[PDB]
Amino acid sequence: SHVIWDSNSKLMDKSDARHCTVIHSMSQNGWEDFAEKYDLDADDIPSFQNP
Amino acid sequence: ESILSRFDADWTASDEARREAKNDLFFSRVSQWDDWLSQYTTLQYRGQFDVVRPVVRKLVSEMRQNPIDVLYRPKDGARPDAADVLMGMYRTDMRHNTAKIAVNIAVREQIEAGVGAWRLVTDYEDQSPTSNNQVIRREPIHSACSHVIWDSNSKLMDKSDARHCTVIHSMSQNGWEDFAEKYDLDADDIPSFQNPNDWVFPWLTQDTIQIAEFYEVVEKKETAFIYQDPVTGEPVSYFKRDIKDVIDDLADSGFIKIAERQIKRRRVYKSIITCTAVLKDKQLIAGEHIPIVPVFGEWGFVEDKEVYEGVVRLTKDGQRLRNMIMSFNADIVARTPKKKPFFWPEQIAGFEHMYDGNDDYPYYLLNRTDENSGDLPTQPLAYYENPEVPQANAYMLEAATSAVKEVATLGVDTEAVNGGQVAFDTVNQLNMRADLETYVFQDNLATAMRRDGEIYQSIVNDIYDVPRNVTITLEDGSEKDVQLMAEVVDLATGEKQVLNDIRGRYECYTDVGPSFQSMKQQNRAEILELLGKTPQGTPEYQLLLLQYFTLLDGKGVEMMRDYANKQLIQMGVKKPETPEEQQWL
Amino acid sequence: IRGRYECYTDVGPSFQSMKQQNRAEILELLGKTPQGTPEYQLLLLQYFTLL
Amino acid sequence: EWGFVEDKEVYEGVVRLTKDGQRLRNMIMSFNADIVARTPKKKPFFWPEQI
Numbered sequence: 001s002h003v004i005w006d007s008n009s010k011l012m013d014k015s016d017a018r019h020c021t022v023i024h025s026m027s028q029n030g031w032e033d034f035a036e037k038y039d040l041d042a043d044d045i046p047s048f049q050n051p
Numbered sequence: 052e053s054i055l056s057r058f059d060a061d062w063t064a065s066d067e068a069r070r071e072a073k074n075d076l077f078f079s080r081v082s083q084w085d086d087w088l089s090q091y092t093t094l095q096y097r098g099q100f101d102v103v104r105p106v107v108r109k110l111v112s113e114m115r116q117n118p119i120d121v122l123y124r125p126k127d128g129a130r131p132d133a134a135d136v137l138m139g140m141y142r143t144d145m146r147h148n149t150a151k152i153a154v155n156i157a158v159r160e161q162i163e164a165g166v167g168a169w170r171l172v173t174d175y176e177d178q179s180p181t182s183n184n185q186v187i188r189r190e191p192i193h194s195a196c197s198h199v200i201w202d203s204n205s206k207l208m209d210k211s212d213a214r215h216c217t218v219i220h221s222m223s224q225n226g227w228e229d230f231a232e233k234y235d236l237d238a239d240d241i242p243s244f245q246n247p248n249d250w251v252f253p254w255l256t257q258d259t260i261q262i263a264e265f266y267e268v269v270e271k272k273e274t275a276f277i278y279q280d281p282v283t284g285e286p287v288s289y290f291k292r293d294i295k296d297v298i299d300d301l302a303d304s305g306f307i308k309i310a311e312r313q314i315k316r317r318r319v320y321k322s323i324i325t326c327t328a329v330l331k332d333k334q335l336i337a338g339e340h341i342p343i344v345p346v347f348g349e350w351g352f353v354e355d356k357e358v359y360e361g362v363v364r365l366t367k368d369g370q371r372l373r374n375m376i377m378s379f380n381a382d383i384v385a386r387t388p389k390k391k392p393f394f395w396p397e398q399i400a401g402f403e404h405m406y407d408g409n410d411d412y413p414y415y416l417l418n419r420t421d422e423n424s425g426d427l428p429t430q431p432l433a434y435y436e437n438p439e440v441p442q443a444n445a446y447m448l449e450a451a452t453s454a455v456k457e458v459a460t461l462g463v464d465t466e467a468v469n470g471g472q473v474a475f476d477t478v479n480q481l482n483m484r485a486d487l488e489t490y491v492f493q494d495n496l497a498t499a500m501r502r503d504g505e506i507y508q509s510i511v512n513d514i515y516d517v518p519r520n521v522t523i524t525l526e527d528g529s530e531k532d533v534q535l536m537a538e539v540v541d542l543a544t545g546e547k548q549v550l551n552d553i554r555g556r557y558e559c560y561t562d563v564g565p566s567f568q569s570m571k572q573q574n575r576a577e578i579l580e581l582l583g584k585t586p587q588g589t590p591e592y593q594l595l596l597l598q599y600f601t602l603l604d605g606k607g608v609e610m611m612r613d614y615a616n617k618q619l620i621q622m623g624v625k626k627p628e629t630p631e632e633q634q635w636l
Numbered sequence: 637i638r639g640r641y642e643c644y645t646d647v648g649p650s651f652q653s654m655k656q657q658n659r660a661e662i663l664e665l666l667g668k669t670p671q672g673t674p675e676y677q678l679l680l681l682q683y684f685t686l687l
Numbered sequence: 688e689w690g691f692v693e694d695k696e697v698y699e700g701v702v703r704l705t706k707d708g709q710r711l712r713n714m715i716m717s718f719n720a721d722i723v724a725r726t727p728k729k730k731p732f733f734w735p736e737q738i
Binding site for chain 4: 004006009
Binding site: 368439 | 716719733
């Protein structure tokens with residue numbers, strides 16, 4: 001929906017930047033095993049492109 | 052207020068109360084009986100209509116087309132012949148099948164209402180623990196209809212994470228029986244929740260029967276074990292990532308540990324999840340692995356809304372409107388005083404003798420004179436009402452028939468090739484892959500091929516450990532070679548309950564191909580249609596002998612297993628998985 | 637001792653295990669057993685239906 | 688594998704013909720459903736002198 005990325009898109013090998021556009025979104029139940037990454041302040045008070 | 056976390060995830064499931072509960076409200080109403088409840092000035096006779104269900108029940112015949120009768124994906128040098136009870140899960144035969152026939156009604160809740168789940172006799176079954184070879188098949192979950200559906204993930208399941216967070220089963224005053232196989236405590240809390248309603252509530256349900264049990268929440272079994280920190284071993288570390296590389300070399304010859312994995316774990320526990328109620332006590336379920344039966348349906352979503360809208364998306368206004376036309380035809384006879392043309396009946400109301408419907412020749416008196424008028428006809432022939440605009444409606448019906456028919460179109464096929472395989476029947480094999488995992492996931496006690504003398508397993512071998520002269524069967528006689536004559540007959544190394552990654556067992560799982568796949572069966576089914584794809588010639592006289600049997604074990608076929616080809620063996624035979632017979636050799 | 641008995645539901649196709657199923661498919665005629673000399677083994681014996 | 692115009696672009700669907708492709712079928716819906724409420728009582732009337 002909110003992710004539109006213009007970079008390369010052609011060669012399946014991608015000799016280009018070698019990084020897909022990385023965007024991850026879920027609901028507040030994402031505690032899960034996700035506490036196995038980051039979890040210091042656990043909220044950076046960000047927001048991303050919500051229309 | 053983080054002392055309760057998952058509870059406001061119940062109140063995150065409050066997002067489906069004011070939005071998606073209307074959705075499943077209609078999902079029950081649009082596909083079953085009435086639809087639109089506004090209720091303003093409604094017509095008299097109603098309530099036998101339906102004309103909803105049939106369209107799906109024919110299509111779901113396709114659902115019935117995928118038995119496939121799977122076997123174990125045969126191996127190369129592994130011949131589990133006498134390995135017997137292990138992989139004989141599919142020899143469960145007629146042993147117990149039971150509830151399977153309910154899966155037909157399990158085709159209804161995937162469209163109509165929120166999809167349910169499947170019950171299991173709780174873990175280890177207490178009905179006749181006679182040796183091994185004990186199981187039962189495919190028991191469903193009650194209800195899961197109008198009350199609550201998941202907020203968890205709703206993607207697809209890899210999930211070494213926490214999975215299948217809830218079990219809630221009963222509705223009745225009689226509902227006390229389900230948990231009776233546990234300590235069955237009597238009448239404590241009885242909370243008030245789960246209140247679907249339009250807030251008018253003309254009827255009465257104060258009924259509840261809601262229980263919430265989940266045994267170990269966020270049990271967080273992981274590895275997360277580090278040591279050998281550089282200086283003094285600062286506490287409160289909790290190394291956060293599973294990947295290990297850069298630490299491959301640090302201290303050169305510095306130190307050694309010499310200890311196995313012995314895990315002493317403090318447990319942080321918050322609550323057994325519910326607001327005011329804590330009941331479940333003293334017993335917890337299962338273990339590392341996840342036998343859990345319940346499976347998934349097929350629904351899409353992006354934002355909070357999650358809908359797979361049914362096959363009933365179509366007929367709507369081609370139904371109610373034909374119910375409304377009873378106002379434009381049947382209701383005029385109620386509006387009109389039933390067709391009373393009267394031109395100069397000077398006697399006003401109908402008299403008893405003249406009109407009962409009786410047959411009267413004269414119908415005597417008519418006198419055409421009146422007050423001062425003038426002489427010219429005044430004609431009633433202006434007809435009052437006539438039917439108006441029948442044609443439009445008449446054709447409206449055909450147009451509606453086309454519109455409602457249109458959604459029947461998927462993969463239209465008569466016969467032969469170019470079949471109709473589409474999502475639904477392919478994606479519920481991911482629901483039916485759960486079968487064989489629910490069975491063969493792990494077996495701790497009896498995997499034993501030969502009786503091992505469990506955990507005492509040395510058995511008889513010790514004779515070959517003696518220094519002095521050692522022998523073997525000698526001097527022939529009546530007793531020469533009998534099965535299980537002493538050689539070793541024992542297993543070295545280690546076989547223990549839940550050995551996990553060590554191979555030899557876990558290799559047996561599902562196939563999921565087209566209708567008939569290969570035990571040997573692929574080759575004979577590629578004949579496709581007609582006939583004549585089978586090679587010919589003289590050699591298949593002598594090569595056609597054995598392997599063309601699809602009977603396997605019949606009734607009287609066991610006669611021919613030992614004898615087989617015999618007399619002139621110098622051509623060679625298969626000598627199949629049992630080469631039991633060597634004597635004069 | 638629930639569950640150990642010799643007779644329970646066989647539910648499946650209507651074919652009968654006594655010299656039918658191989659030939660009991662109606663619209664599929666023949667051809668699944670081609671020609672052979674040693675098939676005497678199956679020819680000279682197993683074709684006898686005595687019930 | 689699709690066509691292109693400039694930069695990266697608005698997505699061409701097969702639904703671009705289906706937007707108004709339904710067209711005016713809906714106009715036969717205009718004469719029936721709720722608009723009898725707009726019509727005040729088709730009046731069968733003549734010689735009603737009841738004052």
